[PDB]
Amino acid sequence: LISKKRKLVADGVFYAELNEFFTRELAEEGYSGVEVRVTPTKTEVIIRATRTQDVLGENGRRINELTLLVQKRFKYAPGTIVLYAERVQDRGLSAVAQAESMKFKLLNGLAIRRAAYGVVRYVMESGAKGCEVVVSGKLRAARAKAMKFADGFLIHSGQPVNDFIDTATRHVLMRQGVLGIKVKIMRDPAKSRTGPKALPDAVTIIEPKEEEPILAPSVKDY
Amino acid sequence: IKIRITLTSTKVKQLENVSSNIVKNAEQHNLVKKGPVRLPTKVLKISTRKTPNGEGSKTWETYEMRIHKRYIDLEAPVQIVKRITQITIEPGVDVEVVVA
Amino acid sequence: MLMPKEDRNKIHQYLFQEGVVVAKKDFNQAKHEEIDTKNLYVIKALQSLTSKGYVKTQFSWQYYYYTLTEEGVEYLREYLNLPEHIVPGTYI
Amino acid sequence: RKKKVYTTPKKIKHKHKKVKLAVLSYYKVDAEGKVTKLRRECSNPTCGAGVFLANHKDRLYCGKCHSVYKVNA
RNA sequence: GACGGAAGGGCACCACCAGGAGUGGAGCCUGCGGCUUAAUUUGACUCAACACGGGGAAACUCACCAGGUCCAGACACAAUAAGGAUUGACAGAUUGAGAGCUCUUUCUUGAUUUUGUGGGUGGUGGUGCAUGGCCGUUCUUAGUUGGUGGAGUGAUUUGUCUGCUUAAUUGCGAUAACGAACGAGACCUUAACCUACUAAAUAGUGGUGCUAGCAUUUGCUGGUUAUCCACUUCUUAGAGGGACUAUCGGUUUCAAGCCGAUGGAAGUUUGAGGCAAUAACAGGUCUGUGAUGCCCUUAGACGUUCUGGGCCGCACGCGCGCUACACUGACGGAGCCAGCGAGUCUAACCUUGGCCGAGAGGUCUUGGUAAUCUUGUGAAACUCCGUCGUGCUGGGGAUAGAGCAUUGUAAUUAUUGCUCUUCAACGAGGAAUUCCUAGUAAGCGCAAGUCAUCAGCUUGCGUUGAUUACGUCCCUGCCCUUUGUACACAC
């Protein structure tokens, strides 16, 4: 009905609305992203989470409630908007889930240094190429301080930082204020399967195959 | 009948593979068809100040969203028309059906 | 503040019909979606229900998505005396 | 947040909420007989024919007709 | 480490032999500082505020100002109590009305309601010197950091460096260092050259479906789809081609590099952008938040019904800018050239008209869910015939009074546009101060942003186009090394 340019802008906006809804409601279960599928007379939203059984509930009661919420937001024909929640593997290789676990650990009350070190160890052993946790705020003092815990090695400039680097910025409400966690995870270029296969500067040399000389006059008679 | 499929997506890779599989299946099915007419790419620009408040140098940024629109005009029986329309459906790419 | 019995029953019966409501942050609209009553009426009544302890709210760009609870539905179910396994509020 | 004098005197004179007076609704006092009516309603159907409407002085005000009711009684 | 009116080397038109364009000279659209009853809201104080808070506002925005004036004990604790708790309501007393703000008196949706707590809500209230995020700036310059080995009791050094180049800790290289990480590059877009792999009634050629001017001479200009043939070698496209200093000279412990000439797109990484170094501002932002912490108010509160006033009072000073000192100009007539830019669905967006006017506006939709419609956006100093013609003139609508109107339920203290007038500054414009390496300076114009209505602003594009730049630190700043220091909130 609406012109296509405004319709796609509204599609992106609605993506952002439901993404905020899922990030704000689906935090405790480690929400880490969505995938919206487009098809004539049917829209599908894939919710990649970790605690997917504890999202689905009994016979998908909660996910059915969520897709009904979206359906009533859009006033679309019931059943057109469908939701499916899947257990995304390697929950450690996701900035959103790692920052959410940081938030939960901090609110639980574990010391910030040990928390950051635990998350960075988990991220490192989970196969991540590089990790960086920046915690900003009041840390055992009344003046703001920032602690940066890094491992591996990341990048900051170019397109590779745009694509490989997954970033999550979370504002944890603590007792004396708000702390800020910036989790920056560099992933593997050869673990994308989309776009560039490797870093634009890191070259891989091809394996040669040696061939023996002739050493003698032979004639292939046929 | 003169049906027409037009697609108005934003992701060029999905756009191109949709077009490629459509034209390749049409060619392997040995029909009569018109080539994919490829309208100019429309770039939506939004120019805004980087700063939330008014302090600092007067620096600006431009966020661009690229829109790719292609279309194909066909004439065929209804059954195979619906078959071609409904197969090879991909998320992110929006397609619609028109006449003449 | 005054809460009309007719509109309260309308909102409760819509909550039992569907299971959840969206309350767009538009006060004085006086023409709610899917309910005849006023938007401020819906929003305040749902906040009253939450404070009573029968439903939870999510804001998500000031839209007021609602979601009922176990005791929240069972209290109203025994209030209206509707029998068990007859009418879940938000059944599949 | 310190410039407030309240020059005008105490203006909190909220109108009363129908204080509980003596037994209201003195319809009539007829033992073993028909209880009559006073200042009866007109031929308008929407009147309840048993509802005690307001009759202050040479005018009638209808409870049902809350907004639009202007008649010469 | 910082600094030095210390030394060496290398850089930068946020710096300069040179030159161009402005400001402070005139007026005016704008933003800042002090008096004003109650208000002329608040933030920002060098570069790194001053056409910035996308802040071009008459409601709202807008919390500032004078005013009537309501609820939230949301949720749970002690109360009368259906012989009842409660909203709202008319010509009749000041508020402008069917704003019961208080009435000489009532009607009355019907358990929804009033006194102190525990925990709260709202706040464009304060704290940005509690903060998160973000952004600007040191410095957008070439610069930061481990591991393992060397040095030193140690702080800490080497690595990260004598020499040689553009922008480069860029490299060649010597070497107590070897091997790495981040920045630079590398990367992703933008404009350029493609007679190719694949193109549509949106950019055409000949016959034609119909017709005219130069004539029976072979063509151009015209005007249209289904009636077709050959192509995107001009608009745009998608596995995509080249440019890497290719080649030829000159110069070197005869090593990286520099300086000159060819089809071809240029041989200053092709030109320009995007995110951008475990370091820091106690720089801005608590006026972008249902982000809170600490205090303010806790039922006449900063939450909010309506009326208005206000960055439109100035005695005044300072800034991006616009129009000008005119005969390289002003005006009158004939030509009259870009696209990335925008566009009604729960009720309108830019405009194609039979009628009227240099003006806005009506009857139907040719425009729609959009390369086909607005729009070749036929938009400006640009090419020719004259008038004004050096005399403060025809450049000033500064300034002020008369009439038509799109918008807004109010354009009155010209919102804005079009018909009419006075003449107050202007003889290379003082101290000072800002930008400019190939189509950039500058001139002139167009589109989006803010919008219920108007650009003098900003972000992008288009037309003509630049002498002194392949130089230097003399001024302002940098980077490295050496050096001195009584500095270390660091001159």
Side-chain angles (χ1 to χ4, degrees), chain B:
Chain B
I1 306 103
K2 274 225 172 291
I3 64 130
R4 184 191 285 168
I5 274 301
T6 198
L7 48 76
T8 77
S9 155
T10 75
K11 289 176 245 323
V12 183
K13 162 56 162 145
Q14 269 154 325
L15 191 123
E16 278 304 326
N17 52 61
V18 158
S19 93
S20 82
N21 60 62
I22 285 303
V23 298
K24 82 173 203 65
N25 73 43
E27 159 152 10
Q28 89 185 13
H29 281 4
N30 312 312
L31 273 68
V32 83
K33 43 262 197 188
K34 303 290 124 200
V37 168
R38 304 166 151 142
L39 316 161
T41 48
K42 211 214 208 163
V43 38
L44 323 192
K45 110 183 166 153
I46 276 180
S47 190
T48 203
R49 265 171 81 80
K50 272 148 202 239
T51 176
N53 76 87
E55 198 270 351
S57 265
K58 278 111 165 209
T59 191
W60 302 86
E61 66 191 359
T62 148
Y63 289 95
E64 304 110 23
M65 213 180 129
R66 272 156 212 225
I67 283 147
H68 316 253
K69 19 183 172 143
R70 325 294 194 78
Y71 76 85
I72 43 179
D73 258 323
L74 272 307
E75 195 272 319
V78 47
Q79 48 266 356
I80 78 168
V81 153
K82 305 156 103 66
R83 195 191 45 72
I84 254 179
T85 54
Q86 265 270 339
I87 77 171
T88 54
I89 51 185
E90 320 198 350
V93 197
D94 59 347
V95 181
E96 67 102 11
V97 186
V98 277
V99 278

Side-chain angles (χ1 to χ4, degrees), chain A residues 1 3-6 24 142 153-154 156-159 171:
Chain A
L1 190 39
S3 154
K4 28 184 171 210
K5 144 202 277 193
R6 314 203 263 147
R24 176 184 266 284
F153 53 92
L154 315 80
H156 309 82
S157 61
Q159 216 294 111
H171 319 259

Side-chain angles (χ1 to χ4, degrees), chain D residues 10 19 22 27 34 38 41 44 50 54 56 60-61 63 67 70-72:
Chain D
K10 198 70 67 156
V19 284
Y27 282 32
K34 177 57 177 64
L38 248 184
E41 294 110 279
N44 165 280
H56 329 76
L60 198 55
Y61 153 68
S67 269
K70 197 67 219 93
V71 303
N72 248 331

Side-chain angles (χ1 to χ4, degrees), chain A residues 83-97:
Chain A
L83 257 171
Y84 282 94
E86 79 102 349
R87 178 181 65 191
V88 48
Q89 288 305 129
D90 308 332
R91 36 161 317 291
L93 254 284
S94 115
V96 202

Side-chain angles (χ1 to χ4, degrees), chain A residues 33-51:
Chain A
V34 282
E35 294 148 353
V36 167
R37 186 281 290 121
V38 197
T39 281
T41 73
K42 194 57 57 162
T43 205
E44 190 141 347
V45 167
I46 301 320
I47 291 194
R48 288 173 288 96
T50 88
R51 304 183 80 253

Side-chain angles (χ1 to χ4, degrees), chain C residues 8-62:
Chain C
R8 156 172 274 136
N9 192 54
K10 268 193 295 295
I11 289 180
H12 296 358
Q13 85 181 0
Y14 189 65
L15 199 44
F16 256 58
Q17 169 180 0
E18 271 216 50
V20 295
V21 191
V22 285
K24 160 81 191 194
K25 192 170 254 213
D26 181 22
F27 314 87
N28 323 294
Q29 185 35 263
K31 281 297 296 197
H32 185 226
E33 38 255 58
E34 315 142 17
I35 310 177
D36 305 318
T37 189
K38 295 160 66 50
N39 217 6
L40 86 90
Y41 277 66
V42 177
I43 294 156
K44 298 317 251 177
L46 268 287
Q47 289 158 281
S48 187
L49 286 196
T50 69
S51 36
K52 284 203 67 43
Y54 304 125
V55 50
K56 65 196 78 78
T57 95
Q58 267 277 108
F59 245 104
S60 293
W61 304 23
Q62 54 191 215

Side-chain angles (χ1 to χ4, degrees), chain A residues 213-219:
Chain A
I214 55 186
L215 297 177
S218 154
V219 178

